Amino acid sequence: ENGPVKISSKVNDKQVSEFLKDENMEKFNVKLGTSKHFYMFNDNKNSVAVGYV
C-alpha cells in the first residue's frame, strides 16, 4: 500500500535508463494519482521529460 515506484520496461536510452534506476525511482511512491516528471537530456543531447503516475 503506497509502495515504491519500480520501472520494469527497457528504455533504449542510457541517460533515461540511469534516471529510471531502482535506487532513483524508489524515492517516489505509487499512491493513486501521485506523479512526478523531470526534464533532462537524452543520449542525443535533446531535452526530454520523463515521469510516472
Add this chain to the structure above:
Amino acid sequence: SEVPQVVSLDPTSIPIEYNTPIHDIKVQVYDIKGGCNVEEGLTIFLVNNPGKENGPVKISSKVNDKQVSEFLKDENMEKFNVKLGTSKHFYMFNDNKNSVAVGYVGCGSVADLSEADMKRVVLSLVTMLHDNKLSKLTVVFEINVDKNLFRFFLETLFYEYMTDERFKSTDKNVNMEYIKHLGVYINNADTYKEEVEKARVYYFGTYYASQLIAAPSNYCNPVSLSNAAVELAQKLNLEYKILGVKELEELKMGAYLSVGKGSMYPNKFIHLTYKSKGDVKKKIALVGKGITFDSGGYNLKAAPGSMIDLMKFDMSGCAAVLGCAYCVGTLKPENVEIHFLSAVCENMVSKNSYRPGDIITASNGKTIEVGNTDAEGRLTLADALVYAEKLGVDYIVDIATLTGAMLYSLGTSYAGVFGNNEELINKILQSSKTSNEPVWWLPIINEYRATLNSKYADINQISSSVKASSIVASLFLKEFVQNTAWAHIDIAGVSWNFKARKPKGFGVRLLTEFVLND
C-alpha cells in the same frame, strides 16, 4: 489540575509535539556573490520576470559546476515561464558525475510579492518536497525580499511542510521523510542570517497554537488546556498562576463562571507572566478567548451553516496568546512585562447550564441580561478584561473567534481590529504589516450602543435589532475597560483554513511582533 473522565478511555492530556522534524533541519545561509554549489538533494531557484506577464525563465546566479551551468543556460531555460506558482524539476549530472535534481518556482511578474503571493510560492515548493524522499533542499533567491518577507518565507515553509500525525493510528504516512538540511543562497546574506532562528521560533509558536486548536474538544478541555499552559510556562521559566473555581468565585467573575456552569470541566483561568530583566518600560496584557468547545448552550448551534463540528476552534484566541508566550519566553525581549490571560471554559447543554434570559453580575458590578447563550465569548472576555485592567498595564489586547459576521465583512483572509485608542490600533496595524498576518481596522459605532440598553439589567449581552454583530460585541467589551488603551481582534473568520482543513495559528506572529517592536 487533572482531567475528569466519563469513561476510562477519555483522554487526560493534549498530545503536544515539542521537538518537530523542522527543529532537526540544519539551516545554512550563503551569499549568492560566491556561486551556488549543486551537490545533493533538490535545488530550487525562485525566479521572476518583471514586466513580461508569464515571461521566460532566466537563471542569473553563477553556478560552480560546468555541467549544471550548461543545463541552466538561457537557451535551455527559455521553454519555461515564470507564472506564479508554476514549478519544474530537472535531472542532470554535475562535474563529479553525480546525479543532481534542480528546478525552479515561478514568482510571477510583480517585483514585490504580497503575503498571499509568497504563500503561493511556498506551497509550490512544498509540493516538490512531498512524495519525494529528499535529504536536502537548497533555495536560491533570485527575487527581491526584505528581512521580514524572508522570515515569512521560512515560517510558511516550516509550517506548511510540517504534518500533524498526533491523532493518526493505523493511517500514518509510511513515506513521511523530512529533509535534514536547508541551504539558502541570497544576496546580502549576512543581514538575513538573524531571521533564520527567529523564523524557527515564530514557526513553532504558530504550530504550537495550531496543535492546541486542531486538538479535539475531548482532548483539549479547560483542565487539559490549562495543564499544557503550566507545562509550557515551566519549560520557558515564566511565572504562572491557574485560578480555580474557588478563586474565580471570589474574584466575583459571574459572567465567566455562568458560561461554564453546564460543563463537566471546571473553569480554569490561565495567567502567565513574562517579566523583563531591568527597568520595565511597557506593561502589556494579552487576552485570549478560551472556549474549548462552543455548542452554543441552550441557544444550540442547530441552524444550517452554524458548523457545530468546527467549534473546537473556539479557543483559537487562547492558543494565539499561548503561542505568543512561547515566542516571548524564547526570544526574551527587554523592558517589557507581558501578561498572558485566558478565561477557559466549555459552553455545553445540561441541567446546570445558564439559560437565555438569565441576569448575571460581572466582576466590575455590572449586571448583564443574557439574550443568547451562544454569545458566550464576550461574557468570558468581560471578566477577563476586568482582571486585565486590574493589573495596571499600558495596553490590553484581546483576540477571539467572537462573531461569525466576520465572514461577511472581511472574509477568511483579514481579521478585524476594534479599539478605544488610536495609537494602540496603529501599533496593531503596524505589527500586522511586519508579521504578514493581515488585519483591517473596523469602527466601534457608538450609535448602536442604545440597543444594549436592558430594561432590567445594567446592560444587554446582545442586541435584538442591530445585525452588525462584530460592532455590537465590541461595544459590549468596551464597557469592561474603564481607563486603559484597549484593542480587540476578531479572528472568527480567519482562524480556520478550510482549503487545507487545518488551523492557521493566526495571531501568534502578530502579537509577538507587537510585543517585540514596542
Add this chain to the structure above:
Amino acid sequence: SEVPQVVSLDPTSIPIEYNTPIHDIKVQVYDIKGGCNVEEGLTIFLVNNPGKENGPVKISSKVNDKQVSEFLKDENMEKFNVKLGTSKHFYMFNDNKNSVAVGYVGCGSVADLSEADMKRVVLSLVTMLHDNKLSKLTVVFEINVDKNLFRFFLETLFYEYMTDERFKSTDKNVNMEYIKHLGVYINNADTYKEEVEKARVYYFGTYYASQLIAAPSNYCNPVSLSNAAVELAQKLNLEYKILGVKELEELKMGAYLSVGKGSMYPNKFIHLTYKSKGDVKKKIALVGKGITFDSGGYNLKAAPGSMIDLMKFDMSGCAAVLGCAYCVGTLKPENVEIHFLSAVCENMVSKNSYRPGDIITASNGKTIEVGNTDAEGRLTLADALVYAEKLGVDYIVDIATLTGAMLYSLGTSYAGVFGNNEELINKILQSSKTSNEPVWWLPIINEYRATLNSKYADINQISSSVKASSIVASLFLKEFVQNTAWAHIDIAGVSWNFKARKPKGFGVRLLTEFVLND
C-alpha cells in the same frame, strides 16, 4: 442489571407479552377435496378470477351442506366482484337449521399474489374479525399459493390480528374477543400442515420485536433491554452474556462507549449464542443496532422532518436480532452456531456527551473523527463488527435503522442490503424471497471512500459533501470487517408502519430464513 431511575415512577422493566391470544387459537387445516363444513363461526372464501379485471365471484369448492351450496350458486354470487380487498358477509341457515355466517374476500385478477397484495387481502380479513364476537374462523383457499406464501398468510394474519395493549390503562379492551379456532381448507392440507406451527413461531418473533420497538424509551432503555434479552435467552436455554462498561473499557470499545457517554443508562453489550448438538458447519454472527433513543446528541434532531418522536425505534435492528433469537431457539436448527449481538446504548444531550469534532478510537485501533453526533449507529456498529469478527464466524450480518436516506432510495417497503461478498448477498436475497420481507441490493461505491479521509484521524465518521449517506455509511462499516464475508441491511425506511402507527418487526423472518436455509 438494575435500571436507574430519576423518580420512583420511572419504569424498571419492559412489559413483554409471551402469552398471546394467538397462541390459544387451535388451527386445523383440511383438504379441499373432502368438502367444506359450514357449522360454527365465520367461513370466508378467498376467490380469484384471472383475466376478468373485476369479474364475478365463483365458489368452486364442494360444500358439504345442501342449504349453503344453494345460496352459493353462481346465479347468486354473480352480483359480487373480485376486486382486491373487497369483502362481503352472508347470513343463512344450514341443512341443520342452524345460523351460520359465510363471506368472501376478493383477491384480484392476477394469479401470483404479491406480498403487498397478500397483506391487503389479509387486512380485509382482519376487519371482519374486528367488532365481531366470533368463536371460530374458517378460511377456504380458492387461490394458488405455495408453502411460503401460505405461511406468510398465517404470519401476517396473526400479526395484524394481535393488538398491543401493554400501555393501556383506562382505555383497554372493552369488547376484545379473539377467536379460539381457525380452520383452513386447501388442496394439500398435507404439505401446508407443517407451515402452521412455523408461522406461529415466525409470528411471535416478529411480534416480540414489535413489542420491544413500540416500548417507549423510558420503558426500553439499555439496561431494561439487556435484561429482557437475558430473560429471553433463559427461556430458550441459550447461552447469554451481558458486557458492562468495565469489560467494554478493557476491550477498548471507544466508539461504542463515546455514543453512550451522555446517557444516564450504562452501555450494555448483548451476546446470545445458539449452538447445535451436532457438528457445526457454519458459524454466523447477527449484529443489531441498539439505540434505545436517538436524540441525535449535540447534533440535535431539531430540523423539520427529523421526527425525534419516532426515535424510540432506533433499536429495531436489535429487536429483529432478538426476535430471530426466539425463532432459532424455538425451531432449533442443526449444524449451526449463531451469535446474537447488539451494542446497546442511548444517544442523549448532556455535559457528559461526546461532541462534534471529537476523535475517538475503535477497538481495532482506528481513530475516528466525529463529524456528526447523530451518525451514532455506525459508531456503535463499528465496535460490534470488530467484536463479531473476533468470534471467527463465516458470515457477519448487521441490521440497522442507519440512514434516513433510505426513504429517498427504496422507500417504506424495500430494505437495502450492502456487503462485501456476493455469496452472502445472494443468500440474503434468497431468504428475503422466502420470508417475503422485501430487500434490494444497493452498491458500495468505492469512489466515495476518499470523502472519509480525515485530516487528523484515521477515518472520518461522515462525509461532508456526498449526500449518498446510505452508501457512505456502508463504506464506514466496511473499514471494521477485515477478512470476513459481511452484509449490512439498512431498515431505516421500512421499520415503522406509519399507516398503522406501529412497528413492523422487520427482519425477524428474513434473518431466520437466512439461518435455517443455509
Add this chain to the structure above:
Amino acid sequence: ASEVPQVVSLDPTSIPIEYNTPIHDIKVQVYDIKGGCNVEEGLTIFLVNNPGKENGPVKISSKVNDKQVSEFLKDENMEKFNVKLGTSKHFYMFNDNKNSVAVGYVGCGSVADLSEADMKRVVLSLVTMLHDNKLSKLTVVFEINVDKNLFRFFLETLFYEYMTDERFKSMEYIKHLGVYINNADTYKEEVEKARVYYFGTYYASQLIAAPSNYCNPVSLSNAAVELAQKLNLEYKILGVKELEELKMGAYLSVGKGSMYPNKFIHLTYKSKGDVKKKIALVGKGITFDSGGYNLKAAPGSMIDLMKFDMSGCAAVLGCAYCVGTLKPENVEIHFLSAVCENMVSKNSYRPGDIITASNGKTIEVGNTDAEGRLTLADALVYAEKLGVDYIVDIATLTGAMLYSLGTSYAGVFGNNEELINKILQSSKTSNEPVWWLPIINEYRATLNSKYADINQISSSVKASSIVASLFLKEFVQNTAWAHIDIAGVSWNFKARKPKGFGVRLLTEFVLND
C-alpha cells in the same frame, strides 16, 4: 420625455414631485447669543448640556429679556429636569406683554462634542414638539458648542425631519426660525447652504419612497429630464436601441423581463470657467428588485422594501440639484444611472446565462438577484469613456453591509487612495458617516469562471461586499474609482422612510475637491 406604459388605465404615469415645500417659506434669523435672547412669540427651545454630571440638572445661562420667562427659567425651576440626551419639556405661559409663548429645552447629554448621531436625537426631539405646535415661530438657543459643519447639519436634519411626505395621502408649519449661537456671523452663510442640501436630500427621498408603480425606469428618467430642465443642465436619455448599439449587454440583460424599457440617465453640469476637474457620478437605478428568478423569497429578504433599490440613482440626482443650484466653478460633473427593473417573466434572463458587457467581457450569471453589479458594469464602462478624473458610484449593492457596518455607516471601496481620502473627508464635512473597507485581491480568484471571462458572483466566499467590489473593479481600466455601498444605510426602519443618504456626501465631494 417618453410614454409610461400601463397595464390598466389606473396605473400612474409620472412620479409626483413637490418642489416648493413649506420649508422653503421659513425665514431663518441668526443672532449672537452674547446679546441676550428675546422671547416674545412662538416657541423657544434651549439646547442644554451638563458636562461631567451624567444626567445632571438643567441650567439656563442665557439672559432672556422677559421677566415672566426669566422667572420660569430660574435655576430652582430648571433643576427638576435633567439633560439626558433627547429628553425635553416645553411649557406654555404668558410673557410680559400678555402674549402666549412656549418655552422649553432639549437635553444634549454630558459630552461637550455631539456626534452626528447625537445631533439627530436632539433634532428628533425638536421635531416631535413641532409636529404638535400650531405656533408661527421656533427659536433655538445654542447653549452647547457646535462647529459650522455640525450647525449646517442641524438645520438640514431639522428641515428634513420636519417635512412630511403626503404625496400619496388622500399643526401648522412655522414661518420663522430664530437661532441664537455664539459667533452668529460665521454661521449665517450655512443657512442657505443647509436649505439647498435639505431639498437635495428630500428630493432623493421622494424618488426612493415613491413605490415602484409610480417610480419606474420610464417615469424616473422623465423626472430626471424635468429636473435637468429646471436647473439648466445638459441631459441625454439613452433608449434601448442606443444601448444595443453601445453593446450594453450586462445592463440590458437585467431589464429583459420588465414591461418598462431600460433608460440610461446622463445629466451634465459644466462650469463657465476653465474646467480643471472632471467627475462622473454613477448611481444604481433598479426601480424594483424582485430578484429575478432568484426571487427574494427567503425569510428576511424583505421584498416589500425593494422599491429603494434606486437609492443610488436618487442620491446622484439629488446631488445634481445641489450642484445645479450652488453652481461650483472649474468643474464638469456627469450624473449617470443605468435604470431598469428586475422582474420575473418569460423574457427574464436566467441563472447560468452568459452575457457580454460593453467592454467585451463575458459574464456568467450565477444569481439574477445580483443585478446591481451587472448594470453598474456597463455604466462604469460608459463613465470611463467620458475621460473623467474621478468615478464614484453609489449603490444599494450587498445586503452583507448590514452585518459589517450596519445601518449607520456606509462602506467605501476603491482602487485609488487619494480618491478614498477625498470621500472620507467629504463624509466628515457632510456628516454622512462612511467607513473604508478593503478590496482583498486574494478573493479575486473566486470570480474565475470555467466558461465565461468572469463570474458575476462567488459560490463560496461570503464576503459579498468585497467580492462585488472586485467585480466592479474589472470595469475601470485606468481611472481613479470609488464605490459606496449604501444597502444598509439607505432606509430608516424606525421612521419607515428613506434617509436620502449620499446626497450631501457626494455634493461636498464635488464642492471641496
